[PDB]
Amino acid sequence: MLNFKPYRVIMSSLTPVVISGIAPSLDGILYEALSQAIPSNEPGVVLARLKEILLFNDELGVFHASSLRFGITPEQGIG
RNA sequence: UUAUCGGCGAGACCGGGAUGCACCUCCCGAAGGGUCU
C-alpha cells in the first residue's frame, strides 16, 4: 500500500537481450530483483512485497508492468 | 524475466636503405658633464 504513479523506465542496453518467446515483463525483472533483495525464493512473500512497489490488477490478475519494448534511436536500431 | 547448465581457445619479431645539405659581417653616431679647506 503506497501511492503509485505511472512511470516509464528507459535503460541503455549493454548486451543482447534474449527473449523467451514472450517479451520480458518488467514485473518479472522486479520479482527477480526482490528475490535478490529479500533472501527468499518463495513466490508468495516476494509477490506480496512486489505488490507494495507495483500496482496489481485484481480484476485482471497482473501487475502494471508493460512488456519489453526496444527503444531504437536513429543511430542504432534493433539488431 | 517463460527457466535452471556452457571461459572459445590455442602460434606468430614485420623487418629490411638512406648525411638533407648547400650563401649571407648587421652595422651604421655620440665627451654624461658640473658644485662645495
Tell me the HSE value of A19 on the side-chain side, using a 13 A CA sphere. Answer: 10
A15 three-state secondary structure: coil
Residue A25 neighbours by CB distance under 10 Å: 15
Percent helix, percent strand, percent coil in chain A, to nearest 5 = 25, 10, 65
Residues 6+ apart with CB under 8 A from A59: none
**Resolution of this entry, Å:** 2.9
The three cell numbers of residue A53 are: 512497489
- The answer to whether A14 and A64 are in contact (CB under 8 A) is no
Closest nucleotide to A31 by C1' from CA? B1
Closest nucleotide to A20 by C1' from CA? B2
Experimental technique, in short, is: cryo-EM
Straight-line distance from CA A43 to C1' B32, in Å? 107
